[PDB]
């Protein structure tokens, strides 16, 4: 047998690699951009790949990074154009709220006045608004001063601006290509034996929570658990739920909005006078299909550790409050609720609604930027708002040889946890069309 | 329409298939190639696209090759590089197996498909030469 | 200097001649094909000619013409698409026109093209094979 | 242009073999990537796919019909022909020989393109 | 079997005002591909079928622009920009993905 080489142009090959990504969506004003975004294909085309096996993994892929330095950036272009709060830090006379309080929101609520500028530069006016306890600080009728007036000026986000989280899509440049798991009972890593290509992916809602994941992509057939190392304590948990449960979180208080022109073409959207009566926020979430979600991922969970160990539940240790408390926003409000009531019992082997209460806050710096901050305006009338429980950031605590008890815990401070459990599916290649084989061929002689 | 005849698959749908059966759809591989900040994204990927289908053209067009998806050459296939039967690579194997065994040796055949292609040019033009 | 014999005209000035007087100049239009936000603007407008140059020549390359403005191909062609006489159409109408009429069967004659380069790709390989 | 005729008795009696042949002019039985389809179509009911022949030559039938339809061809005369075996008044309705477009390697086309004229075939005692 | 359902079942309508089909599938048209297989005909009163629109939205040829459609998944519609007194007679709607083929009971058009 005599053979010679050949070289195919086109042949189906490829290799990992890294890349920058590009949003898409329907471009359909809020926080998001989605100016820069090209548009979005009305029906994305799907191949899937048969006979062929891909070796995913998790927590190395690009995607998840690029993805949150891409929010950040959004989030920084979003603040440019707004105005900046920086002649606000003044000395501010505040006095404790007692009308109509309760016991639940008495010391929350403070009436602070204070000097203000005016349109001229050459006047000044004398204003009063109404701050939280989390944003002010004493000084040593009592005078005060906001948190971040010894760490930088805060920037008032626009109103005209929301914070509806839209999808956005990421689809590949030319050259390159994403492969999707079509795998219903896929683990964190390994090898998935059904890979698909897609284009562009599904629509990922850019939702930032710390504690409980919400509005996301539920589970197909059964909860599952991920995690790079089950045995290192020291790497969080992330589970992700088949069947969603609802929270009905509210701002009962009916605030009004107020406008103190503090400068040309600039002004300054105070917390205007509360009118009727007062509450505390919170949120009510099911007792029933909150059971039966634990028991489930407890059942779930006992297949890592054995049948005869018990696990518990408990809260959070400790930190800043952005760790300890589940944060979210709903329309234009940062809450940050007391999940302790629900991180509570026991589990051994083998009226009908939970409250906790939620605390709300203006002066919020984003991510783990402590530079920088901005600040939330008040939203006029009643907030509402309902979502859908998607999944928990779990810790494990330090065991002995007990091996019993083993106690589990919330937290997540970071955001890559979240996009996570959404960009778990995917991961981008690069394909090489230029191959070798031998054939029998000789080529002609000229 | 679908049938018991030919399979039309989709964009890297034959990458299971044999090899044999994947280079019928080498066209379909082929024909795919092709806020300041953000354009300067967008932009730098388009130019890597660009550069790298220009890369591919180029060491196609340094052979014998510059226009053509399959074509031959002269210099035989050395054993060792593979030991391997035809008819199995053709039909018991798929194209990510065979770039994965052939990957250690690609460097050398690059470089003598070149040098056949060069010296191949000069005997051509001292041939033509003499008409 | 013009004469009574050939006329040199000017790019894209034998738009209104005939095809067959046209035909001859095809050399000129394809050899004319090649402050932070001013420089995006110039090197997108830069990006899409040479990404438009590099797909109208990723589309000869597809087909058996990758290297020559005037070619011959295998597949005939269907009297559906212009059921016109020759002569007529070289010697009586321009290329403004012939377009026109055929915009809305060009996809499929692109497609019997690559078509026809694909099985003949093959048919010349396994007849070579023999060698 | 491709012109598809078909051929056979009009009333067949009930129980024996039913033979239906459908001459093809204008273009080759042997394509490269087309398919030939026998399509029945009664009073109300719509149309019915039986079986086809693949250029390749093989053929696939319908689940409901495997042990009574057989689909033959013969390239030296440009032409195929379809047997059905133990016809019943059931089966009486109008006959098409049709052409359609089967996907091929590199691009995928769908469609049935011409249609016959439709041979009536009435059963009856 | 994919049994293709057609809706509304009758639609008189006379020259001068536009009309529309409805044809839905019980099984998903999308192949594995990527690629959807439905297509529309036409067969007058005692005449041959003939096809109109195929792979969802790509006109056949001879086929006046009157016609359109749009879809995908199970969801498919024939919308007619122009409607003529030559419309006559009924209208398939057929998937070529699932073995045995199968095409709609038929929806009637007439003159109201």
């Known amino acids: 047998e005599n053979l010679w080489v050949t070289v195919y142009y086109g042949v189906p090959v490829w290799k990992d690699a890294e890349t920058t990504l590009f949003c898409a969506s329907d471009a359909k004003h809020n926080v998001w951009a989605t100016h820069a975004c090209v548009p979005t294909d009305p029906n994305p085309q799907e191949i899937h790949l048969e006979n062929v096996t891909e070796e995913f993994n998790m927590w190395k892929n690009n995607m998840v990074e690029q993805m949150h330095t891409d929010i950040i950036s959004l989030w920084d272009q979003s603040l440019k154009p707004c105005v900046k709060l920086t002649p606000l830090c003044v000395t501010l006379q505040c006095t404790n709220v007692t009308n109509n309080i309760t016991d639940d929101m008495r010391g929350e609520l403070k009436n602070c006045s204070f000097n203000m500028t005016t349109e001229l530069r050459d006047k000044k006016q004398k204003v009063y608004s109404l701050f939280y306890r989390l944003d002010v600080v004493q000084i040593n009728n009592k005078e005060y001063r906001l948190i971040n007036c010894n760490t930088s000026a805060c920037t008032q986000a626009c109103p005209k601006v929301s914070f509806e989280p839209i999808p956005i899509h990421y689809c590949a440049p030319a050259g390159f290509a994403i492969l999707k798991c079509k795998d219903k009972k896929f683990n964190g890593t390994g090898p998935c034996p059904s890979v698909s290509t897609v284009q562009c992916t599904h629509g990922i809602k850019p939702v930032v929570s710390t504690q409980l994941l919400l509005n996301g992509s539920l589970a197909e057939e059964e909860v599952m658990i991920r995690s790079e190392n089950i045995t290192n304590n020291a790497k969080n948990i992330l589970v992700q739920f088949n069947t969603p449960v609802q929270i009905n979180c509210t701002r009962p208080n009916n605030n009004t909005r107020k406008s103190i022109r503090i400068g040309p073409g600039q002004a300054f959207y105070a917390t205007g006078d509360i009118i009727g009566d007062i509450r505390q926020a919170h949120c009510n979430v099911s007792k029933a299909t909150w059971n039966e979600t634990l028991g489930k991922v407890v059942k779930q969970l006992r297949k890592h550790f054995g049948n005869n160990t018990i696990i518990r539940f408990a809260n959070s240790s400790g930190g800043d409050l952005e760790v300890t408390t589940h944060s979210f926003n709903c329309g234009g409000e940062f809450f940050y609720c007391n999940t302790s009531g629900l991180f509570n019992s026991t589990w051994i082997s083998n009226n009908d609604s939970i409250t906790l209460p939620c605390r709300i806050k203006q002066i919020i710096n984003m991510w783990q930027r402590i530079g920088q901050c901005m600040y939330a305006p008040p939203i006029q009338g009643v907030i509402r708002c309902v979502s859908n429980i998607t999944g928990l950031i779990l810790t494990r605590d330090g065991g002995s040889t007990n091996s019993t008890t083993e106690t589990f815990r919330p937290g997540g401070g970071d955001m890559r946890d979240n996009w996570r459990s959404e960009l778990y599916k995917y991961k981008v290649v690069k394909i090489e069309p230029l191959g070798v084989a031998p054939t029998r061929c000789k080529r002609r002689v000229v | 329409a679908v049938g018991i005849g030919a399979v039309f698959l989709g964009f890297l749908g034959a990458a299971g298939s044999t090899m044999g059966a994947a280079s019928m759809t080498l066209t379909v591989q082929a024909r795919n190639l092709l806020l300041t900040v953000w354009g300067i994204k967008q932009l730098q990927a388009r130019v890597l696209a660009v550069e790298r289908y220009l890369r591919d053209q180029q060491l196609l067009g340094i052979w014998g090759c510059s226009g053509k998806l399959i074509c031959c050459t002269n210099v035989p296939w050395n054993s060792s590089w593979s030991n391997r039967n035809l008819s199995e690579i053709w039909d018991n194997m798929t194209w990510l197996q065979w770039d994965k065994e052939i990957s250690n040796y690609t460097q050398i055949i690059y470089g003598l498909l070149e040098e056949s292609q060069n010296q191949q040019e000069k005997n051509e033009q001292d041939l033509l030469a003499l008409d | 200097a013009v004469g009574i014999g050939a006329v040199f005209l000017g790019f894209l000035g034998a738009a209104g001649s005939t095809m067959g007087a046209a035909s001859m100049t095809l050399t000129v239009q394809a050899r004319n094909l090649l402050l932070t936000v001013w420089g995006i603007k110039q090197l997108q407008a830069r990006v899409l000619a040479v990404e438009r140059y590099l797909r109208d020549q990723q589309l000869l390359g597809i087909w058996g013409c990758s290297g020559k403005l005037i070619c011959c191909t295998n597949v005939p062609w269907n009297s559906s698409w212009s059921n016109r006489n020759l002569s007529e159409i070289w010697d009586n109408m321009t290329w403004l026109q012939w377009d026109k009429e055929i915009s809305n069967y060009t996809q499929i004659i692109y497609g019997l093209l690559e078509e026809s380069q694909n099985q003949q790709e093959k048919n010349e390989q396994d007849l070579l094979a023999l060698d | 242009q491709v012109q598809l005729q078909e051929s056979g008795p009009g009333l067949v009696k009930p129980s024996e073999t039913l033979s239906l042949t459908c001459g093809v002019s204008?273009?080759?039985?042997?394509?490269?990537?087309?398919?030939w389809h026998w399509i029945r179509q009664s009073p109300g009911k719509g149309l019915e796919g039986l079986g086809y022949?693949?250029?390749?030559?093989?053929?696939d039938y319908s689940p409901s019909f495997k042990s009574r339809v057989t689909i033959s061809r013969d390239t030296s005369k440009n032409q195929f022909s379809l047997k059905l075996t133990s016809v019943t008044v059931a089966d009486t309705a109008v006959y098409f020989c049709?052409?359609?477009?089967?996907?091929?390697?590199?691009?995928?086309?769908?469609?049935?393109?011409?249609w016959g004229q439709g041979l009536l075939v009435t059963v009856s005692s | 079997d994919a049994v293709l359902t057609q809706s509304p079942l009758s639609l008189p309508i006379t020259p001068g005002e536009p009309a529309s089909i409805s044809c839905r599938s019980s099984?998903?048209?999308?192949?594995?591909?990527?690629?959807?297989?439905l297509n529309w005909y036409q067969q007058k009163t005692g005449q041959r079928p003939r096809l109109l629109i195929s792979?969802?939205?790509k006109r056949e040829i001879g086929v006046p622009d009157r016609f359109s459609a749009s879809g995908a998944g199970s969801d498919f519609t024939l919308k007619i920009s122009r409607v003529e007194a030559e419309d006559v007679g009924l209208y398939f709607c057929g998937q070529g993905l699932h073995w045995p083929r199968t095409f709609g009971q038929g929806t009637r058009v007439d003159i109201k």
């Open positions: 049709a052409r359609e477009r089967g996907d091929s390697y590199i691009y995928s086309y769908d469609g049935v393109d011409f």
């Open positions: 792979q969802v939205s």
């Open positions: 022949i693949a250029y390749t030559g093989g053929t």
């Open positions: 204008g273009d080759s039985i042997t394509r490269n990537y087309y398919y």
């Open positions: 099984q998903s048209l999308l192949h594995t591909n990527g690629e959807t297989y």
